Design a protein around this ligand. Structure first.
Ligand SMILES: Nc1ccc(-c2ncno2)cc1
Length: 182
């Protein structure tokens, strides 16, 4: 409808796949080469389904901060025959607050879904499903089951992936440029 949705759509059309684990279907953001991200509660194993194709997982790392606190991001390298467009230059370098964000989801349950979530707070600590979690972004939208892995964007930046909600608020794990240096 506007330049926020334009950026979100450009990311969804080229840099997302549908990932299926034993714990469900997730929006999965491809970042560069064969490297993608997913919420850690997806419990990625040795084999994952990518757009309904059986795919070997070459590496999977559940990120934690230097206090050994959960960040709820898993970085996955996929044995896929094709690379993602490199979008690392759209990742923020530091923890921050944002105005006017969009949460975008693409699954079998929720195809081509875009949600203007508004202001995003650097919330920090969250007890997420009983697990102490850091670097959480918060938005005042009643997000539902099926939106985990959804991409949070502003104009020109990919800032997070949806990892939970409490019925009135939604929570995303920050994406930082330093997670994807090589
Ligand atoms: N986060 C939400 C909110 C509402 C819906 C919906 N309502 C009817 N059909 O879909 C879906 C996702």
């Amino acid at each position: 409808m506007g330049p926020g949705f334009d950026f979100a759509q450009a990311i969804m059309k080229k840099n997302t796949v549908i990932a299926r684990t034993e714990k469900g279907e997730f929006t999965m953001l491809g970042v560069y080469d064969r490297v993608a991200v997913i919420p850690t509660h997806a419990s990625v194993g040795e084999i994952i389904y990518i757009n309904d194709v059986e795919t070997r997982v070459l590496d999977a790392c559940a990120l934690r901060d230097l206090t050994d606190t959960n960040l709820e991001i898993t970085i996955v390298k996929l044995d896929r025959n094709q690379k993602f467009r490199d979008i690392r230059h759209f990742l923020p370098r530091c923890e921050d607050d944002y105005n006017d964000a969009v949460l975008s989801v693409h699954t079998s349950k929720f195809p081509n879904m875009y949600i203007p979530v508004g202001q995003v707070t650097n919330y920090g600590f969250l007890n997420l499903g009983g697990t102490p979690t850091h670097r959480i972004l918060m938005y005042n939208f009643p997000t539902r089951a099926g939106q985990c892995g959804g991409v949070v964007t502003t104009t020109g930046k990919v800032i997070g992936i949806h990892v939970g909600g409490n019925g009135a608020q939604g929570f995303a794990a920050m994406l930082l440029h330093s997670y994807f240096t090589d």
